[PDB]
Structure formats: structure tokens, C-alpha cells
Amino acid sequence: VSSVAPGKEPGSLVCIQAKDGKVIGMGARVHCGPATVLVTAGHVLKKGMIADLYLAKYSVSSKEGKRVLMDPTWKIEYGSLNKEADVISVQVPAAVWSRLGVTAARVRKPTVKVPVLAYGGEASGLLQSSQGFATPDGNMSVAHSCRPGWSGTPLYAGSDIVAIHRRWEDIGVKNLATNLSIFHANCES
């Protein structure tokens, strides 16, 4: 488990913070057909129905975190709050991403066994990463050695994304992540 230098995480990665700064989940901007969407975990987004969630990302110029208030009425495209703990996506205005310097990533459907990095942590400027693999036959995982704020964070193959982190398994420090292949094919129509 490595400690990533400030602002050296993928350009598509965002923290999802509470009003006080508590990092409760992560997300990413992704290309979805002709637009982009925030993609995250359903259970992270549910929390913004009763309180103010904030999209945040570390600024290089300013040398500190920046945030923008999320609007619960931004339209959810893929997924559902009501009855699902799967992946969920949101039409975030491009103006929000522009303010946050977030660039959008692509969904790769891995061809061969490939290394993957997942990111999370306690502030936008103090993130950590975790290693593992993505194999075409189903299974994609990172391994933590020896936390719910990682919820919704992607598994990156370079700057492309292949899966989304649900949670960590009950002891063993292995990831259980949603394969983004149903998401992609939905996006691509």
C-alpha cells in the first residue's frame, strides 16, 4: 500500500466528501457515449439525498483541495439508489468538472491479464494506492495488506478504468469490485 504524491493520481479521479471534508467515497469522470458522467457506488450517492456531498480534487496551482457542491437532482443515468448497491452514474454538469480540473477516462474491457491500481484516502492531497490484477474471465481485484471511504473508487489500467470498488471482504484484505462491461454496453447505445 503506497502513498501517492499530491496531484499525481489519475486526472479522472474524484473524492466525494461531506460538508466537513470527510471523504466518504470516490468516483470518476467517464466517457459515456457522447457525454461524460460521474461513476460511483450507489450507497455513496444515497447520502447526498439528505446532506450536502461535495466533489473534490487536489489543485496543482493552488496546492490544496478544491470542491464543488453536488446537486441531488442531477439525473442518474445508469443504476439506481432505491434498491441497489451496484454502480451508479450521474450527469454532472461539465462546468463542475472544468472547475475541478477533472478529465474523463475511458472504460477498457481487459484483453489479457493486466495490472490494476485502486486509489483512496483521507484527503484529496493525501491519497494511497493498492495493487492487483484484471483478468478477462470475470475477476478484478486489489489487495490492501493487514475502510468505507474507498467506496466507488475505480480500478485503473493506466488512465483507462475496468471496474468499480464495492467494498473490502470480511478479513483477508481482498477487493470485491463490479466489472464495468454491463455499464459500458449501456453507455454505448
Author numbering: 7 to 152, 155 to 197
From the paper:
We crystallized and solved 3D crystal structures for two catalytically active forms of Δ117Pro: one in its VPg-free form, the second in its VPg-bound state with fused VPg at the C-terminal part (Δ117Pro-E/A-VPg), and one catalytically defective Δ117Procm form with S159/A mutation. In Δ117Pro chain A, it is rotated away from the catalytic triad H49, thereby disrupting the functionality of the catalytic triad since D92 is too far from H49 to ensure any proton transfer. These are the partial unwinding of the βII barrel and subsequent movement of the bII and cII β-strands and the cII/dII loop, and the disordering of the eII/fII loop. While H173 and N183 did not change their positions significantly, H150 and T154 were noticeably shifted due to the movement of bII-cII strands. This shift could also render the Glu-binding site unsuitable for cleavage site recognition.
Sobemoviruses encode serine-like 3C proteases (Pro) that participate in the processing and maturation of other virus-encoded proteins. Here, we solved a full Pro–VPg 3D structure of ryegrass mottle virus (RGMoV) that demonstrates the structural changes in three different conformations due to VPg interaction with Pro.
